[PDB]
Amino acid sequence: LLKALRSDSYVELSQYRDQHFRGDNEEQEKLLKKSCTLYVGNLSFYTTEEQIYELFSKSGDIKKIIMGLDKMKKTACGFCFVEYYSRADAENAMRYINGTRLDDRIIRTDWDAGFKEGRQYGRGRSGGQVRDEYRQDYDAGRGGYG
Amino acid sequence: DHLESLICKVGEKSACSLESNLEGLAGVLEADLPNYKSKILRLLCTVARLLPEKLTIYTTLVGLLNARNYNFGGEFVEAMIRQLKESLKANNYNEAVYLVRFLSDLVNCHVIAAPSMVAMFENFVSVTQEEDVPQVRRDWYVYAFLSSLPWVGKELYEKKDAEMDRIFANTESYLKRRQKTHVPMLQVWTADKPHPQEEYLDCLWAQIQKLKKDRWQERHILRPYLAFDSILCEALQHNLPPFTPPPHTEDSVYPMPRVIFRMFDYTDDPEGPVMPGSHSVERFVIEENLHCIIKSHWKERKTCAAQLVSYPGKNKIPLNYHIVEVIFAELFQLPAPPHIDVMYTTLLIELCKLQPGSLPQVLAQATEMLYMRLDTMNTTCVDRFINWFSHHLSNFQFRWSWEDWSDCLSQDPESPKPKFVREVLEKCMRLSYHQRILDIVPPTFSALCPSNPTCIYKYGDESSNSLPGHSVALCLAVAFKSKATNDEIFSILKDVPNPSFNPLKIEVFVQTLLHLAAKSFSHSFSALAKFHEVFKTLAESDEGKLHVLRVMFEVWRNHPQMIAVLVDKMIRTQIVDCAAVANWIFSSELSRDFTRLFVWEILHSTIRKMNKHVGAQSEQKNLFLVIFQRFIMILTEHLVRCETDGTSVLTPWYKNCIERLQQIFLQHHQIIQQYMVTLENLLFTAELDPHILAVFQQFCALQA
Ligand SMILES: CN1CN([C@@H]2O[C@H](COP(=O)(O)OP(=O)(O)OP(=O)(O)OC[C@H]3O[C@@H](n4cnc5c(=O)[nH]c(N)nc54)[C@H](O)[C@@H]3O)[C@@H](O)[C@H]2O)c2nc(N)[nH]c(=O)c21
């Protein structure tokens, strides 16, 4: 074994950490490092569960996909969760699907500690995702302005 | 840590020359020999085994260290031989080859005496003399020898040309008697034009013949040690102890034979460097090193693309072409690619990003070529092509010059090209939507576009009051809306006549439960899970499961993706079993969509789930037996009907059927190997039409 050949940067944990996560940081990472669930960001509002299934199945069999919804309008707000049956399949989505297109948008994947009720809603004051509260630009696939 | 980084980094980006860095590293290692000889020996043996793409860089380093310290050189060599035996013992023949090549090139570095290597190679070729041993065993030792020649052939001949000629005689005689039964099962194309897809050993032999004819002179390999002729020449060499190939045992596993992928020649790149020919050792080395690079960096797509693009050689080559070719060679490799299919898609995207002014064009060109050669392309490879191309298109706004492929519009809809376009468009829609795809294609292609994936209800606003259990379902529609329980729906299904197993009860239950959930996948999954108790009851029978599938299909036959996800869910929740799904696939109901990709994706997904079932060897074996039977039967019927009606055997339907059977073996060869006796005695016997039997004999040749 060689350190250089073991390199797997795409599978490394990101800097994100659920602040609402009922638990310690060391514990949240403990779950992230064995998770088979991924958070997917920057999705178009008209991106469907079917399209996410077609794309993410290229790295393995999907157990469940939970679309992110506006805590008020209860509509797709631009993100989702994808759970795989095995860790290896989630990793290949992190290595090869992450950073590629879905509806002509570059999507981002990140390890997730595990789904829970309520985590599928936008924590944004307006209902959608937090990030949309600050964006200045006009995103046709995100409703427009912030 | 520190030493490992130094050794692994030598040869990379540097303000200094390679020779400079090499001599600079030899010095640093020599100095650490007293306190870290053990660690240095291990690290060197390791790069020799895991970094073959840098073979000459490290053989030179060893040569320089050997010159400064003859003792260390002898320990290194001894250590290499030991690792080789352990590699062979562990059935790691693939890594064993890199070690044999490392030892060979060491001769050029004046570390190992030429006679020693010649003696070892003689023992390698003697393996072809062993009796009652797998051909794949004999092949490997022959391959290990020949694939080493590009590096050490010259030296070995200039010192023992007499001994080398005896070896070549025995080698040639052996190659002449090998069986080629496997070839047809591993070729990406049956046509021998424009490029024959050659058996790996026949190709390598031809390349070595060309090298020998050229006085052992090749123009590609980088040999840093030629810059240290002063030091190395005055360096003492070491002898290799007699080598005895570990005897064949029932636990011996050898590499399967291969067929060389080939799609390019110098005429595909006229305004570029002259592409080394299919029968030159340069082509072999180039491809082997690029495959190795991908093997080393497959987990890091950006780093992998950078390493491929920075690939070095003694003379200029049309690298972009070699890179794209090697990638398709992996993607289309039979039985399977070395890495997960999706990696190749992202890898090509990363390469386009790195060579924006040249790679995209070479790729569009290759895509054009693959399309135009689709007529004799194997179905397994076509599936990967379809999946790559569509995925690729979705990352570039689905932009493509479809009019360049209008030649398919005037062909039989079952023919390869038009079928390919239809499957691609269908795949693109799954990554988008109907109207989207209908707009990206010219009007003359609207026909080849996928129909709109709309649900189908037999008891809808089109139905009639004169339908079996009509009103019973209409009452269920309200039952589901009013949020009822299993027990409630059960009693509602009581008012259904029996034309245990009740066909109508199941039909109205499915035709209604699915329709009222035709919204999303989660809407269906949540319905199956809710009334799961009802499903189990209604589908306890085998005819029950088979009917659930037949109804579900008549409800979602225009939404192939929904069928797939529904079938996968029912199996995982025990609503149906893998056996019922396998029978359903060969049922007359899907006879019209039998050649469509979704059918085989569902089958293979079903087999995969079965392969994961713990403690289900019997069930798994039976799943394969059933599949083979159904194939043997439909293929036989076709073959007999063609002999009785004097019709064409090789029809598009037949090409698919026979290749889908082949695909079962290719995709699950390791498991199926356990069924050899049962298959030779009960299913694939001498009684079968040779067309069918040949597929089984090809499968057996992979490890015979
Ligand atoms: C990015 N995510 C999100 N998630 C998971 O998705 C669910 C919905 O959560 P969401 O509405 O995306 O919000 P988060 O809880 O995820 O919060 P965020 O990190 O956006 O909080 C940022 C904080 O920073 C402050 N802030 C100041 N200025 C700015 C600015 O310009 N931009 C942004 N974005 N923030 C700014 C904010 O006030 C705030 O305090 C939910 O379940 C969540 O867990 C997710 N999951 C994973 N595994 N990985 C991810 O990357 C994400």
Side-chain angles (χ1 to χ4, degrees):
Chain A
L1 280 165
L2 289 172
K3 172 192 175 185
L5 300 183
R6 281 201 295 289
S7 186
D8 202 5
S9 76
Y10 288 71
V11 176
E12 288 186 57
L13 306 168
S14 75
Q15 297 295 299
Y16 181 89
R17 268 147 188 58
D18 204 329
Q19 232 47 53
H20 291 173
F21 178 73
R22 227 74 177 186
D24 179 58
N25 181 72
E26 169 196 358
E27 196 186 306
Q28 180 170 177
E29 300 196 337
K30 187 166 180 294
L31 294 177
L32 285 168
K33 291 180 181 178
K34 289 79 175 191
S35 177
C36 295
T37 304
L38 302 174
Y39 158 78
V40 185
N42 196 26
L43 294 175
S44 167
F45 283 10
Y46 77 76
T47 291
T48 65
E49 175 185 41
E50 293 69 49
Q51 304 173 307
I52 295 178
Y53 252 101
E54 185 69 2
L55 178 55
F56 282 74
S57 290
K58 288 173 180 291
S59 68
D61 317 273
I62 293 176
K63 180 177 181 179
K64 187 178 181 184
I65 289 175
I66 301 178
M67 301 301 260
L69 315 167
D70 186 331
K71 194 166 190 178
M72 304 312 276
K73 304 183 181 182
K74 293 193 178 185
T75 55
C77 60
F79 80 94
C80 79
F81 289 93
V82 180
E83 174 182 27
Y84 286 98
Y85 282 105
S86 76
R87 171 70 171 195
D89 293 356
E91 300 180 321
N92 279 321
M94 286 295 277
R95 299 181 180 113
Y96 314 115
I97 293 181
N98 181 22
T100 68
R101 298 187 193 275
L102 211 200
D103 272 346
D104 192 41
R105 303 179 63 86
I106 293 294
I107 66 175
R108 167 176 159 277
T109 65
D110 182 45
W111 286 111
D112 192 67
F115 177 77
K116 297 291 189 177
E117 251 310 309
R119 290 203 60 204
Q120 72 268 50
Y121 300 112
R123 294 174 181 174
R125 191 182 187 185
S126 59
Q129 277 189 281
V130 177
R131 186 184 69 172
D132 298 78
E133 235 80 6
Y134 307 75
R135 63 192 197 66
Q136 320 261 176
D137 66 302
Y138 171 81
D139 194 333
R142 283 255 171 181
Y145 305 100
Chain B
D1 192 4
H2 177 61
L3 253 47
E4 179 171 343
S5 181
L6 293 164
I7 299 181
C8 287
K9 286 196 174 185
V10 66
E12 311 182 318
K13 55 176 178 179
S14 179
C16 302
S17 65
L18 179 59
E19 302 78 14
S20 177
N21 288 157
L22 285 176
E23 206 53 54
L25 179 54
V28 184
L29 293 175
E30 194 193 11
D32 289 323
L33 281 185
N35 300 349
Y36 297 117
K37 176 172 68 180
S38 191
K39 181 173 184 173
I40 295 174
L41 278 170
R42 175 175 56 76
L43 289 175
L44 291 178
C45 277
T46 303
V47 293
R49 178 177 61 87
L50 301 178
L51 264 45
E53 57 264 43
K54 289 172 70 173
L55 171 62
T56 61
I57 289 168
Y58 292 120
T59 50
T60 299
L61 177 55
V62 174
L64 297 184
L65 270 50
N66 179 59
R68 302 191 185 202
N69 194 307
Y70 182 76
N71 294 169
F72 175 76
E75 270 189 282
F76 176 75
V77 178
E78 193 189 69
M80 284 294 288
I81 296 298
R82 280 200 294 287
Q83 176 59 54
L84 172 55
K85 300 180 66 59
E86 257 45 70
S87 284
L88 296 165
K89 182 174 175 62
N91 293 313
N92 290 305
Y93 290 99
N94 283 158
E95 302 194 319
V97 186
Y98 309 138
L99 296 175
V100 173
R101 288 186 195 154
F102 196 96
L103 294 174
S104 301
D105 200 51
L106 275 179
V107 174
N108 302 313
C109 297
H110 294 302
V111 173
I112 294 180
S116 291
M117 276 311 302
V118 174
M120 184 180 296
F121 284 139
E122 301 179 306
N123 298 312
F124 270 43
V125 184
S126 68
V127 168
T128 60
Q129 290 298 62
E130 306 181 3
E131 296 200 70
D132 309 305
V133 295
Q135 168 167 301
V136 290
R137 169 191 176 72
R138 304 188 185 100
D139 291 350
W140 187 81
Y141 275 93
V142 170
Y143 180 72
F145 166 53
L146 298 181
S147 62
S148 290
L149 301 190
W151 285 273
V152 78
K154 187 181 179 185
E155 186 56 36
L156 298 190
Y157 214 63
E158 303 184 316
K159 294 296 184 178
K160 300 293 175 182
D161 62 295
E163 280 84 306
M164 288 301 291
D165 278 299
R166 305 195 192 79
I167 302 308
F168 269 80
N170 294 153
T171 297
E172 179 163 51
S173 63
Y174 172 67
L175 295 172
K176 284 181 174 294
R177 52 190 173 78
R178 296 178 65 241
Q179 299 297 120
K180 305 289 182 54
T181 313
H182 53 285
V183 176
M185 176 180 263
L186 308 174
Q187 292 179 312
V188 172
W189 291 284
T190 58
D192 75 311
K193 234 62 190 177
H195 307 281
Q197 303 304 291
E198 311 173 54
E199 206 276 338
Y200 86 119
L201 276 174
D202 286 321
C203 191
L204 179 49
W205 174 252
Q207 304 171 314
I208 295 299
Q209 290 289 65
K210 169 172 164 49
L211 179 58
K212 184 182 177 185
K213 179 179 180 177
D214 299 330
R215 295 103 142 295
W216 303 101
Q217 292 283 174
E218 53 72 59
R219 293 147 28 66
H220 176 72
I221 303 169
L222 283 183
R223 307 172 186 268
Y225 45 83
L226 289 184
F228 301 93
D229 177 280
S230 305
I231 311 174
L232 300 172
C233 287
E234 298 196 301
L236 277 63
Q237 298 151 57
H238 305 274
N239 295 307
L240 287 179
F243 183 91
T244 309
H248 167 66
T249 70
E250 291 203 65
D251 284 67
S252 295
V253 183
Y254 313 94
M256 293 182 277
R258 299 183 293 284
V259 164
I260 309 297
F261 179 74
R262 186 61 61 226
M263 74 178 285
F264 290 140
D265 64 44
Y266 74 108
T267 85
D268 291 311
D269 184 38
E271 276 56 67
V274 180
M275 187 182 299
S278 292
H279 282 186
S280 68
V281 285
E282 290 89 344
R283 195 63 170 286
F284 172 73
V285 178
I286 289 172
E287 299 198 308
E288 170 75 346
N289 286 340
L290 295 172
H291 279 296
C292 282
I293 288 171
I294 288 171
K295 171 168 143 296
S296 293
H297 311 278
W298 69 281
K299 302 184 290 293
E300 302 271 20
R301 71 202 208 200
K302 240 167 180 53
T303 294
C304 192
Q307 291 305 298
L308 288 168
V309 168
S310 70
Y311 178 67
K314 180 205 293 176
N315 283 297
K316 290 209 65 176
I317 57 180
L319 192 59
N320 286 332
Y321 283 80
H322 291 303
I323 289 172
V324 163
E325 186 160 37
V326 157
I327 288 182
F328 279 125
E330 293 206 6
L331 181 64
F332 297 140
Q333 185 177 252
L334 295 179
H339 313 289
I340 185 173
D341 299 23
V342 72
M343 177 280 279
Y344 299 108
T345 302
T346 312
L347 176 56
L348 283 169
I349 287 171
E350 291 293 342
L351 287 158
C352 282
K353 284 177 161 185
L354 215 50
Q355 296 280 271
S358 48
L359 198 297
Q361 300 93 292
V362 172
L363 184 57
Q365 188 187 349
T367 295
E368 171 58 46
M369 290 159 72
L370 295 177
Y371 175 88
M372 289 299 143
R373 297 175 193 175
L374 270 172
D375 291 325
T376 75
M377 186 176 241
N378 195 275
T379 294
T380 292
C381 306
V382 178
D383 281 35
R384 298 182 192 156
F385 180 12
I386 290 169
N387 282 311
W388 162 68
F389 188 53
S390 61
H391 190 187
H392 176 73
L393 284 178
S394 76
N395 272 270
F396 294 100
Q397 304 74 50
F398 292 107
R399 287 183 287 88
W400 188 254
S401 58
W402 302 99
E403 42 283 314
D404 276 59
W405 297 348
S406 283
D407 74 324
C408 81
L409 303 178
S410 72
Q411 295 187 321
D412 183 313
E414 311 175 308
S415 204
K417 296 186 187 172
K419 178 175 166 50
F420 167 70
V421 176
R422 284 208 309 291
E423 298 288 347
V424 170
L425 295 180
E426 190 179 308
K427 282 294 178 183
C428 292
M429 185 180 92
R430 288 205 195 180
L431 294 163
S432 181
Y433 47 102
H434 189 196
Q435 195 51 60
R436 216 305 195 194
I437 310 304
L438 203 56
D439 291 317
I440 72 170
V441 304
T444 48
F445 282 69
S446 55
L448 289 63
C449 288
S451 63
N452 197 47
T454 46
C455 180
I456 292 181
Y457 197 12
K458 196 170 189 175
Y459 305 154
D461 299 299
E462 176 196 60
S463 65
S464 59
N465 53 181
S466 55
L467 288 173
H470 175 63
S471 57
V472 185
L474 310 179
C475 297
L476 287 165
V478 189
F480 287 141
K481 293 176 180 294
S482 62
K483 177 56 185 177
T485 183
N486 294 303
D487 310 66
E488 292 183 58
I489 285 66
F490 269 132
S491 198
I492 303 169
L493 292 175
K494 293 281 191 172
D495 306 306
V496 187
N498 194 304
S500 55
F501 169 64
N502 198 308
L504 191 60
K505 289 189 181 181
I506 292 175
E507 176 177 53
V508 300
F509 176 65
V510 176
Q511 276 267 24
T512 296
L513 186 51
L514 287 185
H515 179 282
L516 308 186
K519 188 171 184 178
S520 69
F521 286 179
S522 279
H523 272 50
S524 302
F525 297 165
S526 60
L528 306 178
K530 191 181 297 298
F531 306 99
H532 174 276
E533 184 188 306
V534 182
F535 271 99
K536 295 301 291 295
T537 306
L538 277 60
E540 188 182 13
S541 163
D542 282 324
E543 300 178 297
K545 305 178 201 294
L546 289 184
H547 196 56
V548 172
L549 294 169
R550 176 168 41 238
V551 177
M552 177 271 284
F553 179 69
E554 297 178 304
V555 171
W556 288 120
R557 58 185 301 155
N558 296 309
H559 192 358
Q561 197 195 341
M562 170 65 102
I563 303 176
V565 297
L566 288 175
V567 178
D568 166 276
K569 195 62 64 177
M570 297 179 297
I571 295 179
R572 291 176 183 282
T573 51
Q574 292 76 60
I575 299 302
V576 296
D577 52 57
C578 297
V581 170
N583 280 309
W584 171 67
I585 281 170
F586 291 80
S587 72
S588 64
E589 283 69 292
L590 277 58
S591 183
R592 296 186 66 63
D593 295 315
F594 193 67
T595 55
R596 298 181 71 192
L597 269 64
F598 77 99
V599 168
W600 305 101
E601 301 186 309
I602 293 179
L603 184 62
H604 288 298
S605 174
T606 306
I607 297 168
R608 284 201 298 285
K609 281 186 281 291
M610 176 61 80
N611 292 172
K612 293 185 176 181
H613 287 178
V614 56
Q617 303 184 183
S618 173
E619 193 174 355
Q620 175 180 225
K621 183 172 186 172
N622 285 172
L623 181 62
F624 285 101
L625 291 180
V626 177
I627 295 171
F628 291 134
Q629 279 200 294
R630 311 296 295 88
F631 266 121
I632 297 170
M633 184 190 98
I634 64 181
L635 285 167
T636 296
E637 168 184 54
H638 176 84
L639 294 168
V640 173
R641 180 166 49 197
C642 285
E643 170 186 50
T644 302
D645 300 64
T647 334
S648 179
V649 178
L650 298 181
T651 64
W653 182 88
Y654 175 75
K655 196 177 91 63
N656 177 66
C657 198
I658 194 66
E659 274 164 24
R660 292 305 184 177
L661 170 56
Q662 166 191 19
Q663 178 174 49
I664 296 297
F665 283 112
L666 293 178
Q667 181 163 168
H668 309 284
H669 63 85
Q670 182 150 186
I671 288 163
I672 299 168
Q673 257 256 76
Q674 312 175 107
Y675 312 153
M676 281 302 304
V677 174
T678 297
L679 293 179
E680 301 181 312
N681 286 334
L682 308 181
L683 296 185
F684 296 93
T685 66
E687 294 181 353
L688 292 187
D689 179 296
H691 283 153
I692 305 175
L693 182 61
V695 181
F696 175 68
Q697 303 169 304
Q698 292 158 3
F699 161 66
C700 193
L702 298 180
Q703 291 287 271

